[PDB]
Structure 1
Amino acid sequence: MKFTVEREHLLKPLQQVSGRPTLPILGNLLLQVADGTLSLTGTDLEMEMVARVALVQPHEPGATTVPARKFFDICRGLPEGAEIAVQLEGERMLVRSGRSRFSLSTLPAADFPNLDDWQSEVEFTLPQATMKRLIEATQFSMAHQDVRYYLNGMLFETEGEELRTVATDGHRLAVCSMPIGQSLPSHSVIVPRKGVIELMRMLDGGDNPLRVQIGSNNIRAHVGDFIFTSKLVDGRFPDYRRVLPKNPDKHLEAGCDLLKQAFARAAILSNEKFRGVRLYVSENQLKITANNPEQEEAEEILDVTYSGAEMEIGFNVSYVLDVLNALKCENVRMMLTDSVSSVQIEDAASQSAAYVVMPMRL
């Protein structure tokens, strides 16, 4: 195996495939020269990323694996414009550029783990911007290290012509749906949280669409010359349709920024261990109050649009701030039922994302 290529052509591929490993070979990249192509592959056993680089300078086929981070840091640390010559020499891989030389340890390409082969059952394309919107809208509501493993990822659901994401940790839920102009079978799978992250990282923001393939136990995404594949998570994800409040009859509209800053300020004098605030809803007015063990008190009064019965209801500050930060809105609609029931929250101008938040007792 032998190739020479510009540093410039390696940097993006290396960054993508490089994303303490539980087994040494999982800290290595698989390098393969075949035809006029260098392929680079990274994997953590649950997912993998493959990148391709065209070779025009003399090259020789073959394959090996080398330490990912070291190889990346070497390439990145060489000067702009550098040409990098690489050749496998028994147990080492020699990397040369200018009067810099590096000898890296190898592990056999034969050892490099592959995902058990699988079959695509559902396929579609969509714009990168759309996938980005869908993930960003809901990612923050995924569980972290919940024993209910299926909550640690994100539901991807096809229905009609829409792709939908759902995420929840049992206390708050996020759902976002976007049309993609293709008639789709109804289908639902759970992508693990590291997969969601990896998938976001491969989006750059061109009009070049993403190609998605979904199997019974895998998801694959192709964009540019990168191919990402992840295992899916087993289990029965919650049905957002049953989480949405049935009759959230009390509708309140507020400015998003004003609401956010009122929450943030009042939270300063909330309990540090469990930060929440009390909302008193009255005709065209919202009062937000916080109290702490030191008997300190914050109060914020806001003008809002609300006509309906008065009620007091408490919320975790972070849950509401997370939602407002995901909506990036001009005005927000809060749809309330009573003091002990979850609230539904949306951009006042769009129904494509919705958030459900359990109340907090204070």
Structure 2
Amino acid sequence: SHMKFTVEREHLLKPLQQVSGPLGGRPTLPILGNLLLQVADGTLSLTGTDLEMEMVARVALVQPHEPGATTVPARKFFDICRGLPEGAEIAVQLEGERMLVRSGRSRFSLSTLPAADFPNLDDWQSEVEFTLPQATMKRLIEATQFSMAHQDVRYYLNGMLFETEGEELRTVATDGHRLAVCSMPIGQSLPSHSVIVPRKGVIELMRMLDGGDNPLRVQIGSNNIRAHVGDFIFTSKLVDGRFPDYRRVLPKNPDKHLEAGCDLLKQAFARAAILSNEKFRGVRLYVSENQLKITANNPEQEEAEEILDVTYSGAEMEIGFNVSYVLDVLNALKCENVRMMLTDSVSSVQIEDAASQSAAYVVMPMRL
């Protein structure tokens, strides 16, 4: 191939870092360990992929260049660029099946694989499109991502529901024990639609949101989702499956409302957790007039007890929880006071920020 370019080190590092995101992590096919490099019309494009998602970065070429393409080992190429001195100019060209990298008195010959072999995601058509602030997308994912399933047999929970309704973008994540849902206004009228993004793609979308006054442009097809921020384009296949309806898992008539300081509540659960069962992490809540008591004990018969002043006037009751599920919610709620809505010992609890209803969390209890 004719491909040639020379680019300063600092223009390459962040793109190489971003497009390497989808790469593992248990090799599969050798070309999947390579980045696709393409030069055309004064632009260098870099692509990495795991066959399910891909990340693309564009770099402007202001120095002499020649069009072409190849694929190169991502970790070796990244380390070469990162290892060169600050300010270095990195010259690249192909000689036969080898990629030559030269900077000053450093020279490297890398083995390549043909660009024609690189599995890039196939052509697909956009059906829903909108723009939103990156901070909004970031808040929506951060607010729910921890409740996603991981390696669950119900493959449709190993991901996150993205749902457009009215003026809102909504995310839902659940593993069948706990659920998180967050809605944010988008300031544009959208069709009613919902897709499942795989959890690995959710994570990389979250890690691409860095920059400043750049907006985030989203395109959703029938089988794919695409996000454009600045010079980076993320694309992922969608999960083909039916997602549970968060509207139906919400507690239907909670008659007991507790309100408490988020920091003090989180710290009491964290300390009680220390003497909980290491495998099951069960803790026990007793609520009474303006009082909350958290207890925990383990197979060695050790015991923790925490008492907190809360705002509660409902009937006294006792309920068990996996303390990690509760602490995930309270760590996600970066707020002053949380509200807990309860029904009985065998029913789900809904947890939210006492001052905001944009996010809600539902956690199923444990049999005490």
Question: Normalising by structure 2, what TM-score?
Answer: 0.97
Identity of aligned residues (%): 100
* CA distance in structure 2 between the partners assigned to 1:55 and 1:207 by the alignment: 23
* CA distance in structure 2 between the partners assigned to 1:261 and 1:248 by the alignment: 25
Listed one character per residue, the Cα deviations across residues 76-131 of structure 1 (whole Å, up to 9, x for unaligned) are: 11010100000011110000001000000000011011212111000011000000
Q: CA deviation at 1:270?
A: 1.0
Q: CA deviation at 1:205?
A: 4.4
- Partner-residue secondary structure (3-state), 1:246: coil
Asked whether the equivalents of residues 21 and 44 of structure 1 are also in contact (C-alpha less than 8 Å), the reply is no
1:293 matched to 2:299? The reply is: yes
* CA distance in structure 2 between the partners assigned to 1:207 and 1:182 by the alignment: 19
Runs (4 or more) in structure 1 with deviation over 2 Å come to none
Q: CA deviation at 1:166?
A: 0.2
Q: Which position in structure 2 is the counterpart of 1:121?
A: 127
Asked whether the equivalents of residues 283 and 307 of structure 1 are also in contact (C-alpha less than 8 Å), the reply is yes
Asked whether the equivalents of residues 129 and 205 of structure 1 are also in contact (C-alpha less than 8 Å), the reply is no
* CA distance in structure 2 between the partners assigned to 1:61 and 1:118 by the alignment: 26
- Partner-residue secondary structure (3-state), 1:13: helix
- Partner-residue secondary structure (3-state), 1:126: strand
- Partner-residue secondary structure (3-state), 1:272: coil
Asked whether the equivalents of residues 277 and 316 of structure 1 are also in contact (C-alpha less than 8 Å), the reply is yes
- Partner-residue secondary structure (3-state), 1:119: coil
Asked whether the equivalents of residues 123 and 214 of structure 1 are also in contact (C-alpha less than 8 Å), the reply is yes
Q: Which position in structure 2 is the counterpart of 1:35?
A: 41
* CA distance in structure 1 between the partners assigned to 2:170 and 2:254 by the alignment: 22
- Partner-residue secondary structure (3-state), 2:267: helix
* CA distance in structure 1 between the partners assigned to 2:211 and 2:13 by the alignment: 18
- Partner-residue secondary structure (3-state), 1:182: strand
Asked whether the equivalents of residues 245 and 343 of structure 1 are also in contact (C-alpha less than 8 Å), the reply is yes
* CA distance in structure 2 between the partners assigned to 1:187 and 1:164 by the alignment: 10
- Partner-residue secondary structure (3-state), 2:62: coil
- Partner-residue secondary structure (3-state), 2:110: strand
Asked whether the equivalents of residues 7 and 84 of structure 1 are also in contact (C-alpha less than 8 Å), the reply is yes
Question: Normalising by structure 1, what TM-score?
Answer: 0.99
Asked whether the equivalents of residues 31 and 39 of structure 1 are also in contact (C-alpha less than 8 Å), the reply is yes
* CA distance in structure 2 between the partners assigned to 1:138 and 1:111 by the alignment: 37
Q: Which position in structure 2 is the counterpart of 1:198?
A: 204
For 1:181-196, list aligned pairs within 5 A.
181-196=187-202
Note the residue ranges of structure 1 that are not aligned, 5 or more in a row: none
* CA distance in structure 2 between the partners assigned to 1:48 and 1:267 by the alignment: 40
Q: CA deviation at 1:17?
A: 0.5
Q: Which position in structure 2 is the counterpart of 1:12?
A: 14
Q: CA deviation at 1:21?
A: 2.6
Q: CA deviation at 1:49?
A: 0.9
Q: Which position in structure 1 is the counterpart of 2:233?
A: 227
CA RMSD of superposed structures (Å) = 0.9
Q: CA deviation at 1:167?
A: 0.2
Asked whether the equivalents of residues 134 and 164 of structure 1 are also in contact (C-alpha less than 8 Å), the reply is yes
Listed one character per residue, the Cα deviations across residues 205-229 of structure 1 (whole Å, up to 9, x for unaligned) are: 4231100000000000001011110
* CA distance in structure 2 between the partners assigned to 1:29 and 1:205 by the alignment: 23
Asked whether the equivalents of residues 15 and 72 of structure 1 are also in contact (C-alpha less than 8 Å), the reply is yes
* CA distance in structure 2 between the partners assigned to 1:304 and 1:205 by the alignment: 41
